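Q: What changes when zinc ion is included in the input?
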Amino acid sequence: TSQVRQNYHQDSEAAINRQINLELYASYVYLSMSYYFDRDDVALKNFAKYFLHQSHEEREHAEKLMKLQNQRGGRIFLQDIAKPDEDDWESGLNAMEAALHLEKNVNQSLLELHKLAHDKNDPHLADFIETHYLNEQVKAIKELGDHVTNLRKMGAPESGLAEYLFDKHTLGD
Amino acid sequence: TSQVRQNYHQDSEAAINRQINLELYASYVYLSMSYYFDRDDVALKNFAKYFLHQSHEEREHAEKLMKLQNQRGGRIFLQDIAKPDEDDWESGLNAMEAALHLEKNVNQSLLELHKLAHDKNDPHLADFIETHYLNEQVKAIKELGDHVTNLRKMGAPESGLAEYLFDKHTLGD
Amino acid sequence: TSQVRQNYHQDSEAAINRQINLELYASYVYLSMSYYFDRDDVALKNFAKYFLHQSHEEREHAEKLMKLQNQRGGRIFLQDIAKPDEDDWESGLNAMEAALHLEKNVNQSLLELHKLAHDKNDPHLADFIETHYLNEQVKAIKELGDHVTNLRKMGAPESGLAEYLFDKHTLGD
Amino acid sequence: TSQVRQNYHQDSEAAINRQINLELYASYVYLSMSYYFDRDDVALKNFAKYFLHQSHEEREHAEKLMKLQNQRGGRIFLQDIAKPDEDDWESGLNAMEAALHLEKNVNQSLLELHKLAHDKNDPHLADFIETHYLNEQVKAIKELGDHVTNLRKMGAPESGLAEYLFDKHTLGD
Amino acid sequence: TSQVRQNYHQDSEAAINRQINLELYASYVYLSMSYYFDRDDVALKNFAKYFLHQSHEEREHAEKLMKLQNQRGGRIFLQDIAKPDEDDWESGLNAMEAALHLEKNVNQSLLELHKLAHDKNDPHLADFIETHYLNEQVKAIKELGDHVTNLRKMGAPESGLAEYLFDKHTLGD
Amino acid sequence: TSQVRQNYHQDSEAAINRQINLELYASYVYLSMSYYFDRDDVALKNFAKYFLHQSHEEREHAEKLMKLQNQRGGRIFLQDIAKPDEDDWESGLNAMEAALHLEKNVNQSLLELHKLAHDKNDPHLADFIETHYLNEQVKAIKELGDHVTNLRKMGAPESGLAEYLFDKHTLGD
Ligand SMILES: O=C(NO)c1ccc(C(=O)NO)cc1
Ligand SMILES: O=C(NO)c1ccc(C(=O)NO)cc1
Ligand code: NA
Ligand code: NA
Ligand code: NA
Ligand code: NA
Ligand code: NA
Ligand code: NA
Ligand code: NA
Ligand code: NA
Ligand code: NA
Ligand code: NA
Ligand SMILES: [Zn+2]
Ligand SMILES: [Zn+2]
Ligand SMILES: [Zn+2]
Ligand SMILES: [Zn+2]
Ligand SMILES: [Zn+2]
Ligand SMILES: [Zn+2]
Ligand SMILES: [Zn+2]
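A: The predicted holo structure follows.
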């Protein structure tokens, strides 16, 4: 056992490792999304840029969890990073929906993480989740839904013009 | 076939995808290394910082290959990211040796990539490899060996003082 | 023979002259394209501006090849500059496709030039082509295809609005 | 007929197209001259630079005529660009004389253009020629003759020193 | 064998050592040239300054090759530096011709070095030669020939005035 | 005989040429030393940097002697530059001792040069040696001995840590 470890359960430790894996996977998902829009036959640079930024942020989420793992005297054990469920994301619209879905997945897991933290009465962990992750996830989910809403109203994905103008007017400023 | 595709072989395309996977794996390896030194029972902050920076750079290598894939009208197809061969890296010294080994792996693959590019007479690809990757890899390999050399001379890894002072005097400036 | 000439084949010399002619022709093509969009019954100022800039750059490509010709002690011999294949380019969309086609022509010729350089083992010439021309051409081809892709999706060329908005949102920033 | 067309004769329209061709040819002539002086066995950098600048300006003359063509609702129809009458210009002195001759050619054509404009009472065209072209041509002709005069007096072209010093003292400031 | 060594042939290693020797010799040649023009009975300060600068640059070429030798895990083994073929260079004109000759020697050797690198498929070495040496040599050769050309035309070396004025007007700015 | 020559003996002239050769050799020695420490299996960057700087300075010493040779109307005649006595310098410690030895060699020769100058009552030469060389050599000798002293006390060369820390704390500031 680590010399710094205090009130830090083996159950929490494993769940953190899993969350780490989950954050890294989301990064990989967003990476996949970004360069799809960079394809010459898709060509939506702001969609590409948007998702690439998202991708880097998710890595930042993972890194922040790993330090936390070390802070508590838990131990990081990494697992394989799964390839995304798709290679071709079909459209700006399909990707935003998939991104919405992903974050609800990541968010629920974090909420489950909080429940576990609370059940073990580890308030340091509970506030860490609250402060750095929960509202971010909430915010992320609202933004993606806002994006989803606008794209539908504009006539996406059939109107290629709709996605183009959205790329330009929303993601490029 | 992509409208932009010209003189870009299916063999090159697959090898690029593999190189992409390899660069992402190296990022993950360096990520693993970094936070090991962040463990409370290792506690070498500059080793940690060093490898974290390395990690981000490797991602940058991958991202640069993916755009390139799209530039030529090839198609990115992602594969799983393998977990590193180890969880506990033993020492500053062991990690630098493992990092040396990794880059020789990544570098040889790039050299094999260049051979393939040359055999297919795709000079755009050959110069891309030359310009952005080959000298970087060469440089990376020299630096890690320099690090290896110094650590041995100082009495690493048995002298914990050796690694401490190296962390301080080499990696912290 | 020139006093500066070294390892510079008569075959290379003639091919450079031809490349010079080809770069000047592309300049003329882009010149033709630019002022078509400047017609009162077309009236797409950013298309016009875009192609005019392209035109000047191609001249720059030619000039850079001519100095190179003199650098190696080869001799510049100019040939007539052919008029473009069309006078009326029909649309923003048709022109971008024609521009895509032109650059693939110019790029293949440069790749053939590189093959010739390589067959004669003239690495100065090979790197010159690699460094100043090959990636530029690659980049040019991706950009035009990106432009092509977006215009199709928006409903060009039938939607005159599509071309207008593209002119405004893509070429005017 | 163009919606903007007013008092713009079909005869003027064709003559403008011809003038456009003539300006582009002069650009090509000056281009040829410039890089001759860039040859290693000629090596007069300021002669080279001088003519290259001249070349770009002539293109500017052509471009200004093409917009004008579109302004009046005439239509630009491009023709082949003829190669210059020579490949080897012999000397700084021979080139300046040839340049003097070229501008007198271009200037007379413009004066003939003005006569045509005046005969058709198209004062917009007459002032356009007066304002942007006629005095420039006049100025160009004086300067080349000044250059011619000085070179003769110095002992050009036999004195290679004469041309060298002229290159240095006149064209390099 | 060095720990950093990868795809680096013993043949390349020896040829690099030879190139190192060759670059150091050129430095010594230019050193000899520089101070000849510094003699009171020659007294061409800009010729002197010109060659001295050239000399320092060649050393820089050698130093860059030596680091490269170490980068690849090859080993630097130095050999004697030969005295130049002459002590009295006769004139500004004779020296420029000798310098032209020297660089063609150095350049051919580098081209032979590239051939060897290519035959061993060591693209790192091939691009290193391309990037840092080949165009520089090409450029150097053009400049010396330009200098040669001008000096002949001016009446050098018999006209002492020719060399004086060249020293002043070309090398002193 | 040179027009500027006054009170400048043929014996002095030859000894200056020899001193020139000696200064160039020391430069070459320091060059050899510098890049040894740049080897991956030595890896002492400040030792490398230290000796490289020393090397450039020695060249400066030679150049200053050559101008002086020309100032007096003596004539520079260059001789071959000998390779250093060793290729592998063993250690930071061994090199500093060898450098100490070299400068005592160079310094004695200069002192012998001064004796010759004095015997010929050439006070210009005597003060030139005094002012630009003698104290520099004296200073150089003290510094190297200071370096030698510190390295011994620290436990060099067996303590690889000793040399590392010296590299860091003395040569890197
Ligand atoms: O026929 C004529 N005179 O007998 C005549 C010729 C030319 C002009 C003129 O300058 N028009 O612009 C006016 C009158
Ligand atoms: O044997 C050959 N052709 O018959 C041959 C010679 C040289 C190359 C080459 O350029 N390697 O880099 C490839 C093939
Ligand atoms: Na997220
Ligand atoms: Na809270
Ligand atoms: Na709370
Ligand atoms: Na790497
Ligand atoms: Na290259
Ligand atoms: Na190359
Ligand atoms: Na082009
Ligand atoms: Na003109
Ligand atoms: Na050189
Ligand atoms: Na010294
Ligand atoms: Zn997240
Ligand atoms: Zn990499
Ligand atoms: Zn080859
Ligand atoms: Zn081009
Ligand atoms: Zn004109
Ligand atoms: Zn060189
Ligand atoms: Zn000295």
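Observations recorded in class: The pocket of sodium ion (ligand 12) is lined by residues F 26, 58, 103, 106, 137, 140 (CB under 6 Å).
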